[PDB]
């Protein structure tokens, strides 16, 4: 209750490191600063004469929490590091992780500091009362796959799938690791809704199944880029009835007009997110280019979401130290950088997911179907797709003996 007062609003930004994002925190810092300028502009335009400043709490520590305490001194030292952090902490905490902040989430602070994470894909973060996720959690991906597996009423998808292979070697990116972990976890909705599920841990195991006529499933789920699949598959041919679901949610390359499909991504269905409604425009979007464009984008939208909530609370006329502010980052549509950003009842970013296929006639990536995570509903786009599979239809989950 020191940095969130009358015309003094502070944002605590955690800049960790050696995670998925070890990328120049300068980029991330520039994204936060760009977001602050839009917020300042938005509030001045609303006629609100308030100052919004940001405390960049750089970390790159990944230190073990209070759970492990060798002695009494350990506890006392932990409490002193806590009080210093609590006094400097502001109105909102924008960061990249989930639960090291949860022993200190219950420390008074500002009545469970509203937390906005530009990460936390794991199922362990689901249903948290003060957590907002601005990147598609593994739960939303899982909901799409279960819905798609059950679907048997489409002219191209005439079978309800119940069997699948999940490829995971442990060398994937953080997002991919958590997405495949959610599909691996026995307690997950996907595992409960799957009668046969085997995790392929070796490159050889995947390679051997691509040719094996005695395999238990024709569907293989994997995460990464098309270059990762090419290196993994190699010169090995793929059985005519195999479907490879490539999870690559943060790659807009599939929506570029000059993109031809390789000749390996033919028995491949690509699960990605709807292209950024606007892409390749701003100077800073032109130089920041991997999936980390989306990582940094969440940080920017995090400042905008705070700015939107700060205006609202002040318009109505309440305070921000209230536990209400903290539990008021859900069931809302705010004005993001590239468009409107909708958050569900749990504070997670709703997205439109796109399942892409390689058209045999044009050799181009085409939209097969779309999935709205807000209403948890699938919408078919191409009713007569031109697949490599027999009769231009998706084959059955089991080997057709």
């Amino acid at each position, epitope marked *: 209750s020191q940095n969130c007062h009358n015309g003094s609003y502070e944002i605590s930004v955690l800049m960790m490191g050696n995670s998925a994002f070890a990328e120049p925190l300068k980029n991330l810092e520039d994204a936060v600063n760009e977001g602050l300028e839009i917020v300042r502009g938005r509030l001045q335009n609303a006629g609100l004469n308030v100052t919004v400043n940001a405390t960049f709490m750089y970390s790159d520590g990944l230190i073990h929490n209070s759970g492990d305490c060798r002695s*009494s*001194t350990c506890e006392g030292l932990d409490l002193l590091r806590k009080i210093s952090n609590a006094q400097r902490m502001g109105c909102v905490l924008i960061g990249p992780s989930c639960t090291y902040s949860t022993f200190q989430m219950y420390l008074d602070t500002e009545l469970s500091y509203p937390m906005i994470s530009a990460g936390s894909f794991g199922l362990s973060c689901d249903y948290k009362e003060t957590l907002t996720r601005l990147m598609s959690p593994a739960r939303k991906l899982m909901y799409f796959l279960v819905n798609f597996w059950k679907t048997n009423d489409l002219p191209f998808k005439t079978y309800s799938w119940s069997t699948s292979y999940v490829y995971k070697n442990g060398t994937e990116t953080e997002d991919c690791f958590w997405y495949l972990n959610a599909l691996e976890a026995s307690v997950s909705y996907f595992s409960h809704e799957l009668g046969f599920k085997v995790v392929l841990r070796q490159d050889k195991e995947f390679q051997d199944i691509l040719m094996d006529h005695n395999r238990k499933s024709n569907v293989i789920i994997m995460c990464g880029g098309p270059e990762f699949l090419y290196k993994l598959k190699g010169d090995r041919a793929v059985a005519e009835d195999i479907v490879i679901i490539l999870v690559d949610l943060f790659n807009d390359q599939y929506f570029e007009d000059n993109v031809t499909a390789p000749d390996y991504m033919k028995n491949v269905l690509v699960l990605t997110l709807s292209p950024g409604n606007s892409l390749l425009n701003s100077s800073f979007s032109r130089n920041l280019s991997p999936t980390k464009r989306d990582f940094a984008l969440a940080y920017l939208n995090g400042i905008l979401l705070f700015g939107h909530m700060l205006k609202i609370f002040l318009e109505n006329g309440e305070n921000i130290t209230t536990p209400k502010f903290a539990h008021a980052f859900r069931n809302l549509t705010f004005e993001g950088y590239d468009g409107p950003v909708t958050l569900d009842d749990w504070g997670d970013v709703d997205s439109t997911m796109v399942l892409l296929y390689t058209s045999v006639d044009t050799k181009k990536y085409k939209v097969l179907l779309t999935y709205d995570t807000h209403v948890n509903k699938t919408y078919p786009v191409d009713m007569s797709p031109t697949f490599t599979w027999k009769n231009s239809k998706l084959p059955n989950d089991i080997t057709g003996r």
Partner: antibody
Amino acid sequence: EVQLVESGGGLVQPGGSLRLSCAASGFTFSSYWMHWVRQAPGKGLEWIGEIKPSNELTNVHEKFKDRFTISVDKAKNSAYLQMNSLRAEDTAVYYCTRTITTTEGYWFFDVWGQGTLVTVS
Amino acid sequence: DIQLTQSPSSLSASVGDRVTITCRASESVDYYGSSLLQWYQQKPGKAPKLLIYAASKLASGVPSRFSGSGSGTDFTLTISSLQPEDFATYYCQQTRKAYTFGQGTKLEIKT
């Protein structure tokens, strides 16, 4: 009133053993970490170790870990220092004390026992 | 262990005098802007009693004539307008890494 009363001190032969007692009065014993601090001429003050009475978690300094043991009797509201294989270097005034954390998070010894002399010869 | 060295070993002064006792640590006893250094007064016969904590904070009931200063490795206990009752054995103590005490300084005198 917060109080710590010590007993068990006296004469011991080299290689012998002695158990010291720190009887406590007027507080919530489980909450505060109990410590043993010795004082010998030309040795100033020396911290032996500690114990959290709530979960019986002990932390004895490396120098005394091999022969000195700290325990508690929750029902008796008392802390104990079991000293084994005693030498002439262990001849000191032994104290039992507790650590208190302030509102600002600072911890230190606040209340001490009257002290009990242990002589090894 | 963090070794604490006091200076002088012993000193003499009269009632009303200003006295200074220094404490040097083998390594920094600081943590998040706070110096985890304490000053204990061991009166003859009695047990150690806290005077100063967190390098400069006066303990409840301790007279204002006692004052603590310093940071990192060097600390100073200042006793202005000495009173006969302030004539014991003074010690410095650190809480940064486990618990260690200084060898002790003795304020023995002429009243």
